[PDB]
Design a protein around this ligand. Sequence first.
Ligand SMILES: *[C@@H]1O[C@H](CO)[C@@H](O[C@@H]2O[C@H](CO)[C@@H](O[C@@H]3O[C@H](CO)[C@@H](O)[C@H](O)[C@@H]3O)[C@H](O)[C@H]2NC(C)=O)[C@H](O)[C@H]1NC(C)=O
Ligand SMILES: *[C@@H]1O[C@H](CO)[C@@H](O[C@@H]2O[C@H](CO)[C@@H](O[C@@H]3O[C@H](CO)[C@@H](O)[C@H](O)[C@@H]3O)[C@H](O)[C@H]2NC(C)=O)[C@H](O)[C@H]1NC(C)=O
Ligand SMILES: *[C@@H]1O[C@H](CO[C@@H]2O[C@@H](C)[C@@H](O)[C@@H](O)[C@@H]2O)[C@@H](O)[C@H](O)[C@H]1NC(C)=O
Ligand SMILES: *[C@@H]1O[C@H](CO)[C@@H](O)[C@H](O)[C@H]1NC(C)=O
Ligand SMILES: [Ca+2]
Ligand SMILES: [Ca+2]
Lengths: 271, 268
Amino acid sequence: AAVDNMMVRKGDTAVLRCYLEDGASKGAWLNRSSIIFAGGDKWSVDPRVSISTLNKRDYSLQIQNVDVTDDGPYTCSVQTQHTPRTMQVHLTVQVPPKIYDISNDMTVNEGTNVTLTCLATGKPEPSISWRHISPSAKPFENGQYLDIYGITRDQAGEYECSAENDVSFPDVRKVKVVVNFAPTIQEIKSGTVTPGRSGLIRCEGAGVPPPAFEWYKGEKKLFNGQQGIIIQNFSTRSILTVTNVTQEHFGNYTCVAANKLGTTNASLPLN
Amino acid sequence: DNMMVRKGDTAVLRCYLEDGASKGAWLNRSSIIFAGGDKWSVDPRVSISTLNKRDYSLQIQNVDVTDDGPYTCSVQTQHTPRTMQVHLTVQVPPKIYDISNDMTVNEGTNVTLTCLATGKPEPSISWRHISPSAKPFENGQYLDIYGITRDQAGEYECSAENDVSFPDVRKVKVVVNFAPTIQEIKSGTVTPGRSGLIRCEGAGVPPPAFEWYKGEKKLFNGQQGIIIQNFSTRSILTVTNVTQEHFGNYTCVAANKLGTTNASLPLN
Ligand SMILES: *[C@@H]1O[C@H](CO)[C@@H](O[C@@H]2O[C@H](CO)[C@@H](O[C@@H]3O[C@H](CO)[C@@H](O)[C@H](O)[C@@H]3O)[C@H](O)[C@H]2NC(C)=O)[C@H](O)[C@H]1NC(C)=O
Ligand SMILES: *[C@@H]1O[C@H](CO)[C@@H](O[C@@H]2O[C@H](CO)[C@@H](O[C@@H]3O[C@H](CO)[C@@H](O)[C@H](O)[C@@H]3O)[C@H](O)[C@H]2NC(C)=O)[C@H](O)[C@H]1NC(C)=O
Ligand SMILES: *[C@@H]1O[C@H](CO[C@@H]2O[C@@H](C)[C@@H](O)[C@@H](O)[C@@H]2O)[C@@H](O)[C@H](O)[C@H]1NC(C)=O
Ligand SMILES: *[C@@H]1O[C@H](CO)[C@@H](O)[C@H](O)[C@H]1NC(C)=O
Ligand SMILES: [Ca+2]
Ligand SMILES: [Ca+2]
């Protein structure tokens, strides 16, 4: 009368141990109450099941390509002069986790309500954790679903779903969320200007899609290479250069950043 | 004695008289400007600034580089006249008068940016690449860039300073073209009864044009329920319903004027 446990991943080869009682002593394996082997004779038809015999008294049960259906107690009854000896083995077949459905990469507008979904299998059933890959760690409470109400431009990026069950390495998939928003002028600063020399105005801006920059002065649009000015537009900024800053140039300049979702303005005088 | 007065300012060359009936006289190198209250110069900029009676200072308005040189004030006295020679030095803030215009070049070409400026003293010209990852460049009118890479594009700043007033600063936009590169291609969950997606992120200047091929067969935006969304930096293939007929190796292609490139990915 003995008991033992054994845990094996799905697919592995299990070897349930059993020892015979010297010569003229045979063994027999049971599956709950179904006979698998008795001595050298096989009762099971499962080709995965065999007897692994290394020593003359080794009567271990060898199950190949184990599956979750094999879970349960296996009993080895050993013949003897007196009451047979019973060695019982509880087989538990575990399955690594695997995500089988996750929200696909998306593009949404700022302020909308988003819900990410992640579903995974595994034995034991896995715990599903969400995580936002950003300098702000912000570990999110567990759950298959991550609700994001009023999504901000700062909440964009890759989101990581992690399904763990302590069996093996957890499965990890990602989702790319792009948040579109109307442009925002973060800064507008002009440089010093010697009278006869040139003047510069930076206009830093953000926006998804990237914003198109325009420059104005009193409702009149300024153009590159016309009237003695130079507008150089970059991905995140635009620079207005006034060649010769005479007294007839002072005034309020206005930078404009617009995309598909909206616009924005910012004014500044020329020093 | 020396004095520095940048162009346009009003210069006041100081010369104080001795007590009693002592008159002064100002010279320009060796040309007489004033003698007492009488003016020899015709320059209307030149006058005598007098606070108290002993003040015989010379007031030059709107100074120019032509006024550079020594000025001498001779004041009569009981013995040899007393002199107060002052060397006037007129300085000029720097001014860029020619700078390379915004340009577009291919990757690997040899580029030379130019920036020329005047100023008194002659200004030092500094080139600077406005980029998070960049190394400053030696001063000089010319910035040589051999084998320009896509990472060397962006905003270049010429700054000409001579410590007089504020420095002049102009900029140049350099665009570097290069053949497109597919940085990533990723598919989501493959499951009948759900939507399938394949994103294809790519870079390229000019921006690349995206094409999709299913097992060497081109795909169209409305061919058997599929949807192709082409953006500036990525293309997304959306299979409405993932039937068994859509399984296979999908191929994203990104091409521009300078070249092309592809990247494949299977579904299950
Ligand atoms: C130990 O005993 C258990 C329980 O009797 C055996 O599990 C039985 O295992 C087989 C094969 O793993 C299962 O069969 C299958 O049926 C499903 C449909 O239900 C089919 O999709 C599969 O292809 C396969 O034909 C069977 O359901 C399962 N019985 C129970 C009650 O769960 C196990 O095989 C035994 N181990 C041995 C003999 O080594
Ligand atoms: C002090 O003396 C010097 C010379 O001893 C004077 O420089 C002279 O300055 C005048 C104007 O200030 C110059 O004349 C101009 O010439 C330009 C062309 O160069 C012309 O476009 C103008 O219309 C004007 O005619 C003159 O050339 C220059 N001579 C020299 C030798 O430098 C200076 O003006 C005197 N400053 C005083 C008295 O405050
Ligand atoms: C680009 O320049 C190559 C040589 O650059 C040379 O190396 C630099 C560092 C300087 O020392 C310069 O004086 C040298 O001449 C040429 O071999 C190459 O042909 C040039 N490319 C083109 C398109 O002309
Ligand atoms: C998002 O959720 C808020 C409450 O958190 C609700 O007021 C709003 O109507 C929701 N928006 C959508 C589009 O469901
Ligand atoms: Ca030129
Ligand atoms: Ca050179």
